[PDB]
């Protein structure tokens, strides 16, 4: 009997002459720049994504990501209508979160970790509480802004729930199987307890400092492997006690799982004790960053 409240968001239309391209991060194509806007004397650092059947995509995406305001979940800051629709959004400078745990894995300690793991659990609560299925949470999918903080972004595949709706029953279209909950490789159905196991791997790859997880397995062969009983597993830095919930997150019932905002209650813990938890070696004047440029809503 619930019904739906309006989303009163602000979708902010961007000139083209407002902003300076300067680099490629990745080619979707994905572009670093800076964003002047008005008579403003402020420079925002920026990045900058970019055949009918496709705009309607990247639209839905925009009107996600203009929809949500957290600190641990990147927004648009507006769009730019080109030849082709552009996002813009804040530059998270050290990029996706999987290539930063790749690349740093000799430095990187527990306490690190921990915090992207809570930070990730907080986002996704958010996402919980605005009814927001996110369908694509993996490391590749979490940017980071300083070592200390992260957000999830790519809102390609969200979809929201209404008010009194458990399920989104997805059609065909492609979509990540190894980060999948079985429910939803068997039967099409996503919901916010199939985002915690996404959640799950999502730690994995992490705690592997960014291992594929059932690397060389083809995708194919996936949902008979889970349906056996089988998972990912323990990685060598991981007690038990962090491993028990990477499985919590992979039961086959689904409301059995933990709930995000149960994670950021467990993660948090872990964090006031790293080493008990994960045991590991050797553990530009008018610049305004977009964290600091409000745009009334
Ligand atoms: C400094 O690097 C980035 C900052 C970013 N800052 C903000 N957003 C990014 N991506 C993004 C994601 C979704 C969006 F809607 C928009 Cl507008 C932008 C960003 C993507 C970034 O890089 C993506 C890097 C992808 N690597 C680069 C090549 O290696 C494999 C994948
Ligand atoms: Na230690």
Redesign the pocket.
């Given at each position: 009997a619930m019904g739906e409240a309006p989303n009163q968001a602000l979708l902010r239309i961007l000139k083209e002459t407002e902003f300076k391209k300067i680099k490629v991060?990745?080619s979707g194509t994905?572009y670093?720049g800076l964003w002047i806007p008005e008579g403003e004397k402020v420079k925002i650092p920026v990045?900058?994504?970019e055949s009918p059947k496709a705009n309607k995509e990247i639209l839905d995406?925009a009107y996600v990501?203009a929809s949500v305001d957290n600190p641990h979940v990147?927004r648009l800051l507006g769009i730019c209508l080109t030849s082709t629709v552009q996002?813009?959004?804040?530059?998270?400078?050290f990029?996706?979160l999987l290539?930063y745990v790749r690349e740093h894995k000799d430095n990187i300690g527990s306490q690190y970790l921990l915090n992207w793991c809570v930070q990730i659990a907080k986002g996704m609560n958010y996402l919980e509480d605005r009814r927001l299925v996110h369908r694509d949470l993996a490391a590749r999918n979490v940017?980071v802004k300083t070592p200390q903080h992260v957000k999830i972004?790519?809102f390609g595949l969200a979809k929201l729930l209404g008010a009194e709706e458990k399920e989104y029953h997805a059609e065909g279209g492609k979509v990540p199987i190894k980060w999948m909950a079985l429910e939803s490789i068997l039967h099409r159905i996503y919901t916010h307890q199939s985002d915690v196991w996404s959640y799950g791997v999502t730690v994995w790859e992490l705690m592997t400092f960014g291992s594929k997880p059932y690397d060389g397995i083809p995708a194919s062969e996936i949902s008979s492997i889970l349906e056996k009983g089988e998972r990912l597993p323990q990685p060598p830095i991981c007690t038990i006690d962090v491993y028990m919930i990477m499985v919590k997150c992979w039961m086959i019932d689904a409301d059995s799982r933990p709930k995000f905002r149960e994670l950021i209650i467990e993660f948090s813990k872990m964090a006031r004790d790293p080493q008990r938890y994960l045991v590991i070696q050797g553990d530009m004047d008018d610049v305004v960053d977009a964290d600091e440029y409000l745009i009334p809503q």
């Open positions: 991060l990745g994905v670093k990045a900058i994504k995406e990501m990147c996002l813009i959004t804040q530059l998270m400078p990029g996706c290539d940017l972004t790519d």
